[model samples]
Target: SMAMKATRLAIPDVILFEPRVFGDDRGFFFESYNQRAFEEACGHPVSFVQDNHSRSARGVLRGLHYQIRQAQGKLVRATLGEVFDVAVDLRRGSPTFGQWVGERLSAENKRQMWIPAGFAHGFVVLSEYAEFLYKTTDFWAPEHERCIVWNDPELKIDWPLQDAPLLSEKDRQGKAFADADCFP
Candidate 1:
């Protein structure tokens, strides 16, 4: 049994994963999901109950979102093109509270990010278009979901954007970090 390789990010629990890729003249192959390897790397078993996919064009920014009551742990990746993915720690007593980490995920790199619950997650498309995929440990709970404003001065995320990025009505009205709900 081969274990997945993972690098802990600035926020220790958040991890960057590199799956083994075996490539040759006839394209390439990799196990996008392996229960045993993933469990070994994560130090525990994580059962994902749902999978989600979304596509965004360059300049599109979505989230800085999280759920309060039924928080979900996410395993995310970019299946097409590229994007700058980010996670912000919102754990009430966490030393890294309000801090964030970013990574460039692309199809070419074939990397994945693990964002555990108690964090806000978001991304901005950097290519002409990008297809994002993720598996969640919990079901979606809209009533408990919240979004932190992407550009809150307190956060100052270093997004690779030349101009104002596009946003949704919900995202555009995200709560300021100082006023946002957090985990204990």
Candidate 2:
């Protein structure tokens, strides 16, 4: 196991991982992935089936996305630069159902977020350009995918950007939370 410290977010099921990073005058290092520690800290037996990587420029936003059926729990980290990561709970009857949490993650911070199933995940690049990585519990299932618009007033997620964000057409077409599919 790595020197991992997990913190519960406002939505307690959403966990934050700040790994013990070792550094010197030359360089730095940290154990980015330790399967055993992840499962224990997350409090759920997880089997990651996919790893995804993407790079985006400043003000680029993706997600508030989840699958209605094949829900994917994602462990995300900002590797090359900085980003404002957020997760919104969508489980039908949970107390925090429509609640959101945001955190700043960066290469320097060496922090990762555990977004459990039944939540929507998204992030915006704060640096000029940023690279993100994700370990997901399920494979991509387009047919069952859904997105809740990032600026939906009901959720009121205070994203750290004032200008318009760059979005994919799918993200542009994200539905309102009232119209979104949810988990039971």
Candidate 3:
């Protein structure tokens, strides 16, 4: 019924959105995405080319991922459970280059985060399970996909993890930030 509230995170380009939900004796309702409101929040028009969904178990961590060539800007949220989502700026010469931002997104909060292209995106499942969803401004070009090690010493992402997270072979073998490819 109304526009979502948008707030810039520590890394100014990264935005966190809180939707206005209406609850009744039955359930709740809210607009997940409003084209006009969304464009207003970004201060520009956006065209999403793809949608992705992933489910992960507790302790699972995915990413610090980005496309070095066909970079993707993403709008992400959690639908079933909670996650500690993170984004790291990787644009060379950017005022916040190498800086990172994190937020807790969950079904209960119904919050979303906008991560522009040129940033590495990642998340750690905090509940027993989580179903993550996202819309991307670009298509997935596997050839250009790259990952940065989750625990890179230089970037130092503060993952809210108690145990070592479960990772894919590719993620486990992600390159160090220093050795990773980035934008111009």
C-alpha local distance difference test of each model: 0.92, 0.90, 0.92
Give the clashing residue pairs of candidate 3, or none: none
Candidate 3 structure quality by residue, lDDT tens digits, 6-37:
99898988999999889953888888888898
The full ranking of all candidates by TM-score, starting with the best, is: 3, 1, 2
Which is the leading candidate under TM-score? Answer: 3
- Colliding residue pairs in candidate 2: none
The segments of candidate 1 whose C-alpha lies over 4 angstroms from its true place after superposition are: 1-3
- For residues 1-184, what per-residue lDDT tens digits would candidate 2 score against the true structure? 4478989898999999998878853888889888888888877688999999999999999988898788889999988999999999988899999899999999888899999889998898989999999999998788888898889999988998989899999998999988887898
Residue-level lDDT of model 1, residues 1-184, one tens digit each, is: 4655788899999999987878863788888888887787778879999999999999899999999888899999999999999999999899999999999999988889999999999999999999999999998887888999999999999998998999999999999998998997
- Clash count (model 2, backbone only): 0
Off by over 4 Å in 2: none
Q: Determine the C-alpha RMSD for candidate 1 after optimal superposition of all C-alphas.
A: 1.4
- Worst 10-residue lDDT window for candidate 2 reads 21-30
